[PDB]
Amino acid sequence: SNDATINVAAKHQTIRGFGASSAWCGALSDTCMDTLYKNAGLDILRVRIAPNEGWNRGDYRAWADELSNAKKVRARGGIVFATPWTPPASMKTNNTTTGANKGSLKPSSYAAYAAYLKTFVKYMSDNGAPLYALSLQNEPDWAPDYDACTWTAQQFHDFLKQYGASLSSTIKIIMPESLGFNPAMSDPTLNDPTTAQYVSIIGGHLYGSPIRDYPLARNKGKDIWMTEHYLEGNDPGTCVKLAKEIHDCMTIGNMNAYVYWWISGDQNGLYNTRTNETYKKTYVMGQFSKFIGNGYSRVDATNSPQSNVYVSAYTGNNKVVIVAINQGTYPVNQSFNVQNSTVSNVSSWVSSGTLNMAKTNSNISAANGRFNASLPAQSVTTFVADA
């Protein structure tokens, strides 16, 4: 009864990875970076481009902490993308780095902003931490009193038709990083082939709006990345909520990558640099990232085989990986049936209120692709098998 059926023959999106941001986290330590990027297996880092007035006279001091973070992640096998929260104040209609009075990028500074971003990309490259991609703006639809800069959907179109060729010849471009992943923010760019061609990755955040598929983006060949979100708490209930959010991004959103908010900026991050302690949300992320390898594809799996259980699955390099979330307050047994592959050597790891990415030592045997297992209360289990 109510099997989780996994069909390795039905493939979905390619998984780029999972990560977090170093924005406003200073220069993170080797221990923090080892914890996250080696042990938990995160492999994407989002750095901030701090507003830098000296950019065009060779003064990069404002950027050196992120350089350091970038190098540490690259040394640990990760890729790095950059997000600017604002152009320098000299380019803003409000004459400040904040979002005061819905400040925006002066159209008379469009060429300079393009040059600015290219200067950051070349800085990072010249110092041995080349970027994988670059975003045009954080949350163009939010105007708070910290680094911010408004853009309308038409402004992104305006900008890209002029400067997208130059920018994309330099680096993969992410846009638009909407507050709530509003497709209207990017639709004008995607629907005009002149502008769509300059975009590689469609990025968005999950504040306020449910997770959704984005068919236009996928059908234009774009990656879809969830580039910022956080949750408050590290109790088991919050941890399984995070797990279900990642699962929903993978499954409903068809997203190629999931990127948590900041590593250490406050108590809602992944690592506490004041006590040198790992927040338990870290291990939720690890149940995906440590086990899902390079170039893996998501495949069909019964999304919810019984109440409060959620399942997704991935294949690559002759492995099958199954992530099974139990949001219930008690353990439950769950059967799995892998189709169109011959599976062996099943091993599992659990993160829960007690366990941190702990190998279970369970003695799982598979016959004709079927095995079963007990899922602890408020837990995430990852099965890895030969396939």
Size of the site for a second copy (CB under 8 A): 26
If you search the block for the tokens 């209207």, which residue do you land on? 184
Burial (CB count <10 Å: 0-12, 13-18, 19+), residue 297: middle
Residues near 77 by beta carbon (within 8 Å), at least 6 away in sequence: 37, 43
Does residue 344 belong to the site contacting a second copy (CB under 8 A)?
no
Catalytic residue among 66, 139, 177, 245: 139
Measure the CA–CA gap between 68 and 137, rounded to whole angstroms. 22
- The tokens for 363 are 């003695």
Of these, 233, 265, 316, 353, which contacts a second copy (CB under 8 A)? 353
CB of 278 to a second copy, least distance (A): 7
Shortest Å distance, C-beta 347 to Na ion: 4
Q: Closer to a second copy at the Cβ: 127 or 356?
A: 356
Beta strands 319-326 and 379-386, pairing class: antiparallel
CB of 141 to Na ion, least distance (A): 11
Helix axes 110-126, 64-75, angle to 10 degrees: 50
Q: Does 277 interact with Cl ion (rule: CB under 5 A)? A: yes
- Answer yes or no whether residue 43 interacts with Na ion by CB under 5 A: yes
Q: Which is nearer to a second copy, 154 or 354 (CB)?
A: 354
Instruction: Return the residue of 62, 143, 165, 355 that touches Cl ion, per CB under 5 A.
Output: 143
Tell me how far CA of residue 296 lies from CA of 15, 175, 277, 305, 323, in angstroms.
6, 24, 31, 23, 14
Considering only CA atoms, which of 124, 49, 121, 118 is closest in space to residue 88? 49
The one of Cl ion, a second copy, Na ion, none whose footprint includes residue 358, by CB under 5 to 8 A per kind, is a second copy
CB atoms inside a 10 Å sphere around CB 355? 16
Beta carbon of residue 310, minimum distance to a second copy (angstroms, whole number):
17
Establish if 278 lies at the interface with a second copy (CB under 8 A): yes
Rule CB under 8 A: is residue 364 a binding residue for a second copy? no
| Residue owning tokens 């169109």 | 340
Detail the DSSP E strand segments found in the chain: 4-14, 17-21, 44-49, 79-84, 133-135, 172-178, 201-205, 223-228, 257-262, 271-272, 277-278, 297-301, 309-316, 319-326, 332-339, 344-351, 358-359, 370-375, 379-386
Residue 53 falls in the annotated catalytic set: no
Q: Which of 90, 125, 191, 354 binds a second copy (CB under 8 A)?
A: 354
Active site residue 228: yes
Residue 17 makes contact with Na ion by CB under 5 A: yes
Asked if 16 and 225 count as a contact pair (C-beta separation under 8 A), the reply is: yes
- Active site members: 139, 228
Residues that bind Na ion (CB under 5 A): 17, 43, 289, 345, 347, 384
Residues that bind Cl ion (CB under 5 A): 13-14, 24, 26, 68, 143, 152-154, 187-188, 191, 231-232, 234, 277-280, 331, 344, 347-348, 360, 362-363, 365-366, 376-377
Residues that bind a second copy (CB under 8 A): 236, 277-278, 329-331, 350, 352-363, 373-378, 381
